[PDB]
């Protein structure tokens, strides 16, 4: 609550006698007007300390600068009472409803659990789509990345399938007793426009009535921004991990994760190693895709989903490298795809959930899915060859057998991949594949077994 502030940079502020404080803390600071702002507790040395004002900066004076000690580490209140609440960045009551009932003020970062507990996520999951459930599904707790474009229909295709998602234990042989549906979404650096496109999907159909919001606009303060995700992130845990519910964490443009980052080191003196960024991102970032998985004994499992855009769609950047290193999959979007009108414009092989190849098929989703999942993959792409070779010979200039492998691709991207807002049940989604496969007389598919095709086909 002291005064005498020396050395002030932007939303930063130093204060002596910092032996009562400790890095990892925050308190509200008051200049002259007595305005209540804030500031994180950094460098608590003998001489002075380091604080980071919530707001941008304007409002710090030389005379007064006392501070009301909030709490070394602050954490929002957790509970099951948040089935439609709304919060931004830090995550404070903006939805109008009463301050969330605090159950336990857990650290926004409880770090990973016993690695011995962690199990392989293999509970099949639908998303109201075909292509994104057949060729590449998503297993419970599986941290699946989504390579998006920095200005692509991302923002949309994001929240689009968001609500579409629906967990189906039924097909496995269980009910929704221990398998509840919990939707958590948190963005950052959002345009005033977009900040409004979001709030829309929830209000659509029974979407917000079972979810909580979080998103620190880029114009907002850069402080809550970083942690912004960690909030509901650490909070989803109390859901599936503490009670055994089933949560879905979905990142959003880590552009923020790093832009915001730069400031921390840019001030903290944290020298940026490669690509002009902090020489300890891997680590700090790792702690991210760790909040997803499964433990021995608990069925409750939260599924994790990263989603970001590169600087110029360069995978050589951290934004991609990092992920493409810890994430168990890959799912990008191409200009091409969308240019023709494909929506969702999602490529084939370029996108795929690394660990959704085992949690499918027998018992899980559609027995024959086992081989069905690797059929349309090698079979489809096979046609993408006679797709750019028209100018070579022509339409009828090509054989029947291989030419046929063409009509497929077009009927495949236009109808199969571009599925817009539609919501295809995990089963309504598998059928389609079959249907398309009919192009080639029963006997041309070398991927699946004659057994399965000689039936579903």
């Amino acid at each position: 609550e002291y005064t005498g502030i020396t050395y002030i940079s932007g939303p930063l502020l130093f204060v002596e006698n910092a032996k009562d404080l400790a890095y990892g803390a925050i308190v509200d600071i008051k200049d002259g007007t007595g305005r209540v702002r804030g500031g994180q507790v950094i460098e608590v040395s003998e001489e002075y300390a380091v604080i980071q004002v919530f707001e941008e900066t304007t409002g710090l004076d030389l005379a007064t600068t006392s501070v009301s000690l909030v709490e070394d580490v602050a954490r929002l209140g957790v509970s099951k009472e948040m089935l439609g609440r709304r919060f931004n960045g830090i995550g404070k009551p903006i939805d109008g409803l009463p301050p969330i009932t605090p159950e336990k003020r857990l650290p926004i970062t409880g770090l990973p659990l016993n690695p011995v507990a962690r199990r392989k996520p293999e509970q099949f999951i639908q998303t109201g789509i075909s292509t994104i459930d057949v060729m590449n599904t998503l297993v419970r707790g599986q941290k699946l990345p989504i390579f998006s474009g920095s200005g692509l229909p991302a923002n949309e295709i994001a929240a689009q399938i968001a609500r579409q998602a629906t967990v189906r234990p039924d097909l496995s042989g269980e009910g929704e007793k221990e398998e509840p549906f919990a939707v958590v979404f948190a963005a950052m650096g959002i345009t005033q426009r977009e900040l409004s496109y979001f709030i829309q999907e929830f209000e659509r159909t029974g979407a917000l009535s079972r979810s909580v919001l979080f998103l620190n606009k880029a114009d907002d303060p850069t402080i809550e921004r970083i942690l912004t995700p960690r909030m509901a992130l650490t909070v989803a845990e109390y859901l599936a991990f503490e009670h055994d519910y089933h949560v879905l964490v979905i990142l959003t443009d880590m552009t923020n994760y790093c832009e915001a980052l730069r400031e921390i080191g840019a001030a903290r003196e944290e020298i940026p190693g490669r690509r002009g960024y902090p020489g300890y991102m891997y680590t700090d970032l790792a702690t991210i895709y760790e909040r997803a998985g499964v433990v021995e004994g608990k069925k409750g499992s939260v599924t994790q989903i990263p989603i970001l855009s590169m600087p110029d769609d360069d995978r050589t950047h951290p934004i991609p490298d990092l992920t493409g290193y810890i994430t168990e999959g890959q799912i990008q979007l191409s200009r091409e795809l969308h240019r023709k009108g494909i929506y969702p414009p999602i490529d084939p092989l370029p996108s795929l959930s690394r660990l959704m190849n085992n949690g499918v098929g027998k018992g899980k989703t559609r027995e024959d899915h086992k081989q069905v999942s690797d059929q349309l993959y090698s079979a489809y792409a096979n046609g993408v060859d006679i797709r750019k070779l028209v100018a070579i010979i022509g339409e009828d200039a090509l054989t029947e057998n291989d030419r046929r492998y063409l009509q497929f691709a077009d009927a495949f991207e236009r109808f199969f991949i571009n599925q817009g807002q539609q919501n295809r049940s995990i089963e309504e989604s598998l059928q389609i594949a079959w249907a398309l496969l009919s192009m080639l007389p029963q006997g041309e598919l070398k991927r699946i077994s004659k057994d399965h095709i000689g039936k579903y086909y």
Binding site: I42, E270, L355
Partner: protein, 577 residues
């Protein structure tokens, strides 16, 4: 046990005075809660401490307590079957004390005294000791753990507790100069366990894996490396490795591994099919796996772990075999650590350290002797596999700097569903050179001459497929195809050794040998046939040859008998044109 007081708190890094004259890099247990740290560049009455642990809630001047003693490993029996992490923390004594989550600044001895060992005092009081020497043995799982004395130990022995139940802590013996001595000990990772002599890497290593060793092996305790994309059941090789491998000792240091990917191994690991003890191979195994997001230097010590430790047992004359998948990412941590320090990522954006710890990292291999003077397998495998399928990159073109054997896997060769899909034109092992000698020596005088001989496949294949890959069996005279026809069997029968199945999975040299042979003795006459007048697309329809494809699948015992007929079966299965 050097204590002290905190002066400053800069997020992760720390500073504290009241401690002067402490060694560099040691225990460093800052934080009231005795947290995880490391002593660095000192200054005046204080020094720098690197605190990885969440540096949140740190009041200057906290329970600054270090030992001024390097981070070293807890030597001694037990570790086998035992669960450990990045540094050396029993992730299982953890689950049992944390319950579910991961508690910080916590600690549990690698080997709680709760363990009651029954050694045997093979020594006597008042005897001669040599820098770590003979000591006493313990009935470990399947193998009798040989507990021997560590270094600096030269002189007299006093008091020897005879047989009986005693834990690793029970000071069995003592020296007639002071101190005492137990079963387990403590040794710094940064240092290796000198044995006496490294000797000539003559003794050939049978990793049991066909393509692996028949083509390119490693005396014992060599140093190898492999690519592969990230994952791709890459774990396959390293796994089967220990299964067959002619090493009794299994290490393993998964490091900075993809959370859940860091575990699939862990769950499927226990499932051992040990071919010697016939059952859970878990008996002669060591665990260390370390998630990526683990502590800062966690992943960085990971490696050092198995290696350092390997030395303990090795030094005793044991066949250690360390691997650790996700090694390639391992460096990750090194950048993180060296990043935050006045260091410009040399060569390819990465700390200059290369022939650094990496180099020496291997020198702890080969034909180590022992404290007592014995041979000990210390094979190293660089489970270094870039998750982005790279060919030139620090991690790689560095390793290559120094190794011994390279087992390149090709993404395509695999993409076909080929196992093993080890791409050879891209593999090597310098060992063969000096191992060839022993090859014919013990195995068969004419053994090598076959392998080096058949190898011509690639020789007359590399530049044969090339043009002929598209064109194919066409403008070819005839003998043209025969050359790639054989490769076909050699690559679909001989090469491929689906290490998955039990039949061709396990195999010994003299087994694979007949295989390669059966295809040879059929070749020396096969080409003499189309050159004398016999058909091409005819020879190729003989069921006699198909019996070759299975030679690998053949049981190592009937192989011989299966050879007697099969082989001679050719001499007469060919006499028809």
């Amino acid at each position: 046990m050097i204590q002290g007081v905190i002066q400053k708190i800069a997020g992760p890094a720390v500073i504290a005075k009241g401690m002067l004259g402490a060694r560099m890099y040691d225990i460093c247990k800052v934080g009231e809660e005795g947290l995880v740290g490391e002593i660095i560049r000192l200054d005046g009455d204080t020094a720098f401490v690197q605190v990885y642990e969440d540096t949140s809630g740190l009041k200057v001047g906290e329970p600054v307590v270090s030992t001024g003693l390097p981070l070293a490993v807890e030597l001694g029996p037990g570790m086998l079957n035992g669960i450990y992490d990045g540094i050396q923390r029993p992730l299982e004594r953890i689950r049992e004390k944390t319950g579910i989550y991961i508690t910080r600044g916590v600690v549990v001895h690698a080997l709680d005294r709760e363990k009651k060992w029954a050694w045997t005092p093979m020594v006597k009081p008042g005897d001669e000791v040599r820098g770590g020497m003979v000591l006493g043995t313990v009935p470990e799982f399947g193998f009798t753990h040989k507990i021997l004395v560590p270094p600096d130990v030269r002189g007299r022995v006093k008091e020897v507790k005879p047989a009986g139940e005693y834990t690793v802590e029970e000071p069995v013996v003592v020296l007639e100069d002071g101190t005492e001595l137990k079963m387990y000990h403590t040794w710094p990772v940064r240092r290796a366990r000198p044995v006496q002599r490294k000797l000539d890497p003559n003794t050939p290593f049978l990793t049991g894996m066909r393509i692996l060793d028949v083509l390119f092996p490693v005396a014992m305790g060599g140093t190898a490396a492999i690519p592969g994309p990230f994952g791709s059941g890459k774990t396959v090789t390293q796994q089967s490795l220990a299964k067959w491998s002619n090493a009794d000792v299994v290490v393993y240091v998964g490091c900075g591994e993809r959370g859940n990917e860091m575990t699939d191994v862990l769950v499927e690991f226990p499932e051992l099919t040990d071919p010697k003890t016939g059952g859970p191979l878990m008996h002669r195994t060591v665990l260390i796996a370390n998630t990526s997001n683990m502590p800062v230097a966690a992943r960085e010590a990971s490696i050092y772990v198995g290696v350092t430790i390997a030395e303990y047992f090795r030094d005793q004359g044991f066949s250690v075999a360390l691997m650790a998948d996700s090694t390639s990412r391992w460096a990750e941590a090194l950048r993180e650590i060296s990043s935050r320090l006045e260091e410009m990522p040399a060569e390819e954006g990465y700390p200059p350290y290369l022939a650094a710890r990496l180099a020496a990292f291997y020198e702890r291999a080969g034909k180590v002797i022992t404290l007592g003077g014995e041979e000990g397998a210390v094979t190293i495998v660089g489970a270094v596999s870039p998750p982005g399928g790279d060919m030139s990159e620090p991690v790689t073109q560095s390793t290559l700097r120094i190794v011994g054997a390279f087992w390149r896997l090709d993404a395509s060769l695999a993409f076909r569903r080929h196992f093993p899909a080890i791409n050879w034109n891209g593999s090597y092992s310098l060992f063969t050179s000096a191992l060839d000698p022993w090859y014919r020596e013990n195995v068969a005088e004419d053994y090598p001459e076959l392998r080096d001989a058949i190898s011509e496949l690639l020789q007359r294949e590399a530049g044969l497929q090339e043009i002929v890959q598209l064109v194919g069996p066409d403008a070819l005279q005839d003998a043209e195809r025969l050359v790639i026809e054989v490769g076909r069997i050699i690559r679909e029968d001989f090469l491929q050794q689906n290490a998955y199945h039990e039949v061709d999975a396990y195999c010994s040299m003299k087994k694979a040998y007949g295989i390669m042979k059966m295809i040879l003795a059929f070749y020396k006459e096969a080409e003499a046939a189309i050159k004398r007048g016999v058909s091409i697309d005819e020879i190729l329809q003989l069921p006699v040859l198909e019996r070759i494809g299975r030679a690998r699948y053949v049981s190592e015992e009937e192989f011989p008998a299966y050879f007697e007929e099969a082989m001679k079966e050719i001499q007469g299965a060919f006499k028809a044109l």
